[PDB]
C-alpha cells in the first residue's frame, strides 16, 4: 500500500505536520490498549508507532521499560499483538501503522515470515531499534518484498554516507533522532537538525519525523518549522498511561487532551 505517501501528500495540502504517538501494544492490558489507541486516533493522531513487548528493550528509557513490563504482567505475547494489529487495521483504513521492534522478535520465527505477517495484518512500516544500517540488508529486503516500509534512523551524529544510505534504502518516513541516549520525555534534544533535514530532502529521502524527547506543543511546531514532516511522541504519552492506571476514564481524557494539543501544534 502507499499509506505514508498518501498521508504526507494530504498533510502537504493541509500545510500540516504529522503528529505520531507511540504506545506499547497491550499496555496496560489488551482491551485497555485497544481503547487507548482508538482514543489517540480520534483525538488527531496522523499515524501510529506501536511497540511489541520485548524482554530487553535496550533503546528505551524507564518510562517505556515500564510499559513493556506492564504488558508482560498482563500476559501479552507477540502473537496477541498481531491479533491486535489486525483489529486496529480492520477499524481504520488509511492511518499508517509502524511497529517498533527489536531484532530478536523479527528473527525469531524467520525474518521473511515476520514481514509476511506484518503484510497480512496491514502494518505499514517496521523500525528495528537494534539493527543499524550496516546490518539492515535482510530486514529491509524482507520489508520491501512484503510491501512494508523499512524505517531508518538518521542520528544527529550522521555523516554524508549515512544520509545517502538512509535516503536510498528507506521508505515511508526517515526517523530523525533528536539526540543521543534512549527514549524519554525527561531529556529534550538540544541539537538543531535543520541541516540534516535539508540534506535528506536533497537526497530524496522519505519525509522526516523527529523523535525522542518530544513532550510539548512547542517541540512539534519547532520540528515543522525546521522542515521536518512531523514529530513522534512516546514517553509523554506512556507517562499518562502510567499516571492513570487506577482511572481508565481519566487516562483516556488526558490522552485525548494531550494528543489534541500536540496535533494542533502541527499547523504550520
Amino acid at each position: 500500500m502507499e499509506r505514508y505517501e498518501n498521508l504526507f501528500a494530504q498533510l502537504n495540502d493541509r500545510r500540516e505536520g504529522a503528529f505520531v504517538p507511540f504506545v506499547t501494544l497491550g499496555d496496560p492490558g489488551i482491551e485497555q490498549s485497544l481503547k487507548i489507541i482508538d482514543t489517540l486516533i480520534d483525538a488527531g493522531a496522523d499515524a501510529l508507532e506501536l511497540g511489541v513487548p520485548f524482554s530487553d528493550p535496550l533503546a528505551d528509557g524507564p518510562t517505556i521499560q515500564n510499559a513493556n513490563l506492564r504488558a508482560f504482567a498482563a500476559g501479552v505475547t507477540p502473537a496477541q499483538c498481531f491479533e491486535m494489529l489486525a483489529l486496529i487495521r480492520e477499524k481504520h483504513p488509511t492511518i499508517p501503522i509502524g511497529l517498533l521492534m527489536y531484532a530478536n522478535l523479527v528473527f525469531n520465527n524467520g525474518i521473511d515470515a515476520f514481514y509476511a505477517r506484518c503484510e497480512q495484518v496491514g502494518v505499514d512500516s517496521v523500525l528495528v531499534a537494534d539493527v543499524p544500517v550496516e546490518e539492515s540488508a535482510p530486514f529491509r529486503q524482507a520489508a520491501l518484498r512484503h510491501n512494508i516500509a523499512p524505517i531508518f534512523i538518521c542520528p544527529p551524529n550522521a555523516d554524508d554516507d549515512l544520509l545517502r544510505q538512509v535516503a536510498s534504502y528507506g521508505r515511508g518516513y526517515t526517523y530523525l533522532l533528536s539526540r543521543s541516549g534512549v527514549t524519554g520525555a525527561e531529556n529534550r534534544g538540544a541539537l538543531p537538525l535543520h541541516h540534516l533535514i535539508e540534506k535528506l530532502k536533497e537526497y530524496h529521502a522519505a519525509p522526516a519525523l523527529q523523535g525522542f524527547g518530544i513532550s510539548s506543543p512547542e517541540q512539534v511546531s519547532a520540528a515543522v518549522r525546521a522542515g521536518a514532516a512531523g514529530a513522534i511522541s512516546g514517553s509523554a504519552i506512556v507517562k499518562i498511561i502510567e499516571k492513570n492506571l487506577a482511572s481508565p476514564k481519566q487516562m483516556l481524557a488526558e490522552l485525548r487532551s494531550f494528543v489534541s494539543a500536540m496535533k494542533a501544534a502541527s499547523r504550520a
Binding site: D56, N104, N109, I153, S180
Partner: protein
C-alpha cells in the same frame, strides 16, 4: 564500514542502535592501532606482570590422576590479582579507554567478578567507574558489591526485566548510548557487538600463550586437549586462541548443564539453545519460544550469561572446538575433589571444566592423555554455597 570482519562465519555482527555505531567504529580503530603500538603493549605488559602478577603458574595435579594414564595440569588464573582471569582484559580495555581520551568506565556484571575487576583497574588507572548489576544479583552478591564500593566504583542495581545479568547488559548499553563521548563500555566477556569478541580474545590470549610455553617446557609437547568453562566465553577463548592453528590440540568448552539439559534448567545455549539476535550479536541464546530472552541457570553464579561468544559458535560449527555440558552435581563433586586431593579451592565456574576433565580420565583410565584445565578463578567465594548444599544433603 569496519577495518575487520564483524562476523565469525554467520555469528556475531554489530546489532546496536545506529547511535552507537561511531563508538564501535572508534573502539575498533583504537584497538587496531594499539595492537601495533609498542608503547601500548609495554604498558599492558607492565600492568599484567607487576600489578596482576603474570605469568601464572601451571600446576601439575598428580594426586587426582593417580592410577590412570591422564596427566592433568591446571592453568592458575586463580592466582591472578582479583582471583579470576577477568583482570587480564580489564587492564587492556582500561588502557584503550585512556588511548581514546575516555575518563569514565561503564561495566556490567552478573556474579560480580567482572565488576570487581573493572573497579580495581579503574581505581589503579584513575578512571571513574560505574557498574550495572541486576538487583537480584546485587542482593545475592553483597560481598562483591562491597568490594566494588571499597574500590570507589558506583554500583547501580538494575530493577528492569528479570533484574539479572541480561538486564544489566541492557542498562550498560543504554548509558553508553548517551555517554560514549566521555565513557568507555568495558564489556566483561568475549561477546556483544564487534569489536568486543575480538578485543576480549586478544586481551586474554596470554593464558594460552603461557600455557603453550609452560607445557612445552615441562612435557616437551603440546597438550592433547585444553578445557575451559564457557559462560560468555572469555576465559575459554583466552586459553584456546594460541592453539587454534595447532590442530592436534583439542579445544573443549564446558557450558553449565544446571539441573540437567532435559530439565530446561541449564545455561548451555551453544549446544541446547537457539540462535537469536541480542546484546549486539547473532549467537545461540537462551530464549522462549516466542523470542523473549531467558536466563541461564547454574549452581555457579558466573556462568549466567544467557548467550555465548560468537567465535565459540563459529569454532563449534566448523568442528575446530567441541562443546559439552556438566551438571551442578558433577561440578560440585569436582570442587570437593580438588579441595581434598590438591589443596586448591576452585571457583564453581571452573569446577565445570575440571569435572569434564575428570570424566575424560575416569571414563577411559588407560587412555594416555595430557590435559590442561583453565582454572579461571579461585573458589573461596563459593564456600558458603557449598556449605549450604552439603548441609541440606546431610553431608555435614
Amino acid at each position: 564500514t569496519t577495518l575487520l570482519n564483524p562476523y565469525f562465519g554467520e555469528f556475531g555482527g554489530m546489532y546496536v542502535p545506529q547511535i552507537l555505531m561511531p563508538a564501535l567504529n572508534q573502539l575498533e580503530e583504537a584497538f587496531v592501532s594499539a595492537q601495533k603500538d609498542p608503547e601500548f603493549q609495554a604498558q599492558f605488559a607492565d600492568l599484567l606482570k607487576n600489578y596482576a602478577g603474570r605469568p601464572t603458574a601451571l600446576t601439575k595435579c598428580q594426586n587426582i590422576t593417580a592410577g590412570t594414564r591422564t596427566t592433568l595440569y591446571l592453568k592458575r588464573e586463580d592466582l591472578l590479582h582479583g582471583g579470576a582471569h577477568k583482570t587480564n582484559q580489564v587492564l587492556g580495555q582500561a588502557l584503550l579507554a585512556k588511548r581514546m581520551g575516555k575518563s569514565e568506565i561503564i561495566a556490567e556484571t552478573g556474579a560480580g567478578q567482572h565488576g570487581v575487576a573493572s573497579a580495581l583497574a579503574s581505581a589503579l588507572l584513575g578512571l571513574k567507574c560505574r557498574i550495572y548489576m541486576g538487583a537480584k544479583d546485587v542482593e545475592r552478591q553483597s560481598p562483591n558489591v562491597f568490594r566494588m564500593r571499597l574500590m570507589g566504583a558506583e554500583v547501580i542495581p538494575v530493577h528492569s526485566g528479570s533484574a539479572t545479568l541480561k538486564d544489566a547488559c541492557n542498562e550498560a548499553l543504554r548509558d553508553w548510548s548517551g555517554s560514549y563521548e566521555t565513557a568507555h563500555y568495558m564489556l566483561g566477556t568475549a561477546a556483544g557487538p564487534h569489536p568486543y569478541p575480538t578485543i576480549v580474545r586478544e586481551f586474554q590470549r596470554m593464558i594460552g600463550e603461557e600455557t603453550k610455553a609452560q607445557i612445552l617446557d615441562k612435557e616437551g609437547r603440546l597438550p592433547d586437549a585444553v578445557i575451559a568453562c564457557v559462560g560468555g566465553g572469555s576465559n575459554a577463548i583466552g586459553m584456546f586462541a594460541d592453539f587454534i592453528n595447532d590442530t592436534s590440540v583439542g579445544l573443549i568448552g564446558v557450558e553449565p548443564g544446571g539441573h540437567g539439559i532435559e530439565t530446561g534448567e541449564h545455561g548451555a545455549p551453544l549446544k541446547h539453545g537457539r540462535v537469536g539476535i541480542y546484546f549486539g550479536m547473532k549467537a545461540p541464546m537462551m530464549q522462549t519460544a516466542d523470542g523473549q530472552i531467558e536466563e541461564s541457570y547454574s549452581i555457579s553464579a558466573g556462568l549466567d550469561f544467557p548467550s555465548v561468544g560468537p567465535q565459540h559458535a563459529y569454532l563449534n560449527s566448523i568442528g575446530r572446538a567441541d562443546y559439552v555440558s556438566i551438571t551442578d552435581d558433577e561440578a560440585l563433586e569436582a570442587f570437593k575433589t580438588l579441595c581434598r586431593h590438591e589443596g586448591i579451592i576452585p571457583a564453581l565456574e571452573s569446577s565445570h571444566a575440571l569435572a569434564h576433565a575428570l570424566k575424560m580420565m575416569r571414563e577411559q583410565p588407560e587412555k594416555e592423555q595430557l590435559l590442561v584445565v583453565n582454572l579461571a578463578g579461585r573458589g573461596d567465594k563459593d564456600i558458603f554455597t557449598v556449605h549450604d548444599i552439603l548441609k541440606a544433603r546431610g553431608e555435614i
